[PDB]
């Protein structure tokens, strides 16, 4: 009995002193102190400051340079667009409602900014498999007569369009629910609770299986592929003093992109793991939303990772700040 349960919240405080009150009505400062929600805000600031120009400036420069505009890079202006509807549906709403110490938007709101917030995530996630799909298709030929081309990266950008309503949509009409989460400031899939009505069980492990092994094993075998790949041919070629430049830069980019992915899986699969094992006790308000906290941030590090880095977007990049010189 760790928490407080109503109609279509769940409080992770004990009500045995009569103080809790629905986060959609009053503030949650049992949960955390005033200045704790303060700090919830101004980390949501620096998100909002971070991650509105990055990703924005991604669009700005694919409209004045033509040469980014190529159908390897859909899926990263998907990506840019992805982390806008996180900057936007989350970030923002998390900052106004932190604010006020509650969900100041009511059930219905709750609904909104999960999924907005949800569909976000999950199509940066899926656009991150996407790429590494397409990337292990164009350097590893699996296919004896085919060439990638715009077609087929629409395809993929629609795939995570699926894929994101596939996990943000079903809570939405029945299949688990929206939330609010944490502090109760925003809103989520309720992988908290119990729910039979809505089958949350299920749903977890469909999340669990599908929006989380899946992904992961998809890269880790694209990526993998890929660099042996690399590395093969360029063992053939060791006269080529590029080449080896080339195998050592692809090689570690995938390093840092694996790295960077599993940074922001792994506090999920570790918190997962202590709900296997010592399910004894209930703990809140964090709880496993470390991971959430911690995995807002890729919509800051995930652009400077696959964009900021990515040799064109850069140049492009300080060619329009610098009004079209140097
Ligand atoms: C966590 O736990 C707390 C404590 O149990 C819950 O808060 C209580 O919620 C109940 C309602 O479910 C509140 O009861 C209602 O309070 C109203 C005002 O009561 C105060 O004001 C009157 C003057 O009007 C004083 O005389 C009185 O002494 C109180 O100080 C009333 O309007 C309500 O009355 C109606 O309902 C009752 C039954 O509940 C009927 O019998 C009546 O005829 C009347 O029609 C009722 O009294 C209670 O005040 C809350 N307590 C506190 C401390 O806030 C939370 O709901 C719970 N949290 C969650 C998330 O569930
Ligand atoms: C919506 C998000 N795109 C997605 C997410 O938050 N969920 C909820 C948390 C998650 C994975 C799926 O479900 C679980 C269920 C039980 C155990 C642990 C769990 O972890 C998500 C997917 C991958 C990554 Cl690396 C980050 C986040
Ligand atoms: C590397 C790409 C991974 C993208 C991870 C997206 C992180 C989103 O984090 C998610 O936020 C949602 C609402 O904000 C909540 O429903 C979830 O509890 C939380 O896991
Ligand atoms: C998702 C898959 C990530 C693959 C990363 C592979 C990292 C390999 O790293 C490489 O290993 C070689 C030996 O195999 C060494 O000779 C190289 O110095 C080293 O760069
Ligand atoms: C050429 O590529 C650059 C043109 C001139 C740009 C110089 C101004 C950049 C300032 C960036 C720092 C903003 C700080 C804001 C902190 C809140």
């Known amino acids: 009995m760790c928490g407080t349960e109503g109609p279509n919240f769940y409080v992770p405080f004990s009500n045995k002193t009569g103080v809790v009150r629905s986060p959609f009505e009053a503030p949650q400062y049992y949960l955390a102190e005033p200045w704790q929600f303060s700090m919830l805000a101004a ?16 669009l700005y ?10 159908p390897l890079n859909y899926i990263l202006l998907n990506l840019a667009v992805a982390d806008l509807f996180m900057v936007f549906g989350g970030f923002t709403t998390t900052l106004y409602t932190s604010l006020h110490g509650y969900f100041v938007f009511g059930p219905t709101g709750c609904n909104l900014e999960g999924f907005f917030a949800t569909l976000g995530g999950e199509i940066a996630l899926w656009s991150l498999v996407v790429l590494a799909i397409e990337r292990y298709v164009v350097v590893c030929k699996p296919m004896s007569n085919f060439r990638f081309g715009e077609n087929h990266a629409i395809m993929g950008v629609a795939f995570t369009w699926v894929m994101a309503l596939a996990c943000a949509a ?9 939330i609010p989460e944490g502090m109760q400031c925003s809103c989520g899939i309720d992988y908290y609770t119990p729910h039979e009505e809505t089958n949350n069980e299920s749903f977890v492990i469909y999340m ?24 093969e041919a360029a063992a053939q070629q060791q006269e080529s003093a590029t080449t080896q430049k080339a195998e050592k830069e692809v090689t570690r980019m995938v390093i840092i992109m694996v790295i960077a992915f599993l940074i922001c899986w792994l506090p ?3 918190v997962a793991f202590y709900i296997f094992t010592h399910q004894g006790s209930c703990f809140g308000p964090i709880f ?6 911690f995995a807002k941030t890729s919509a800051v590090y995930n652009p400077v990772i696959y964009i900021m880095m990515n040799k064109q977007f850069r140049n492009c990049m300080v060619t329009t700040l610098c009004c079209g010189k140097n």
């Open 268 to 270: 999920y699969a570790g």
């Open 288 to 293: 496993m939303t470390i991971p959430a906290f």
């Open 208 to 231: 669990f299986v599908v929006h989380f092994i899946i992904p992961l094993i998809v890269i880790f075998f694209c990526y993998g592929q890929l660099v042996f790949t690399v590395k």
């Open 43 to 58: 980390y949501m600031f620096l998100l909002i400051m971070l991650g509105f120009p990055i990703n924005f400036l991604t």
């Open 170 to 178: 079903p809570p939405l009409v029945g299949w688990s629910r929206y």
């Open 61 to 70: 420069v694919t409209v004045q340079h033509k040469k980014l505009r190529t």
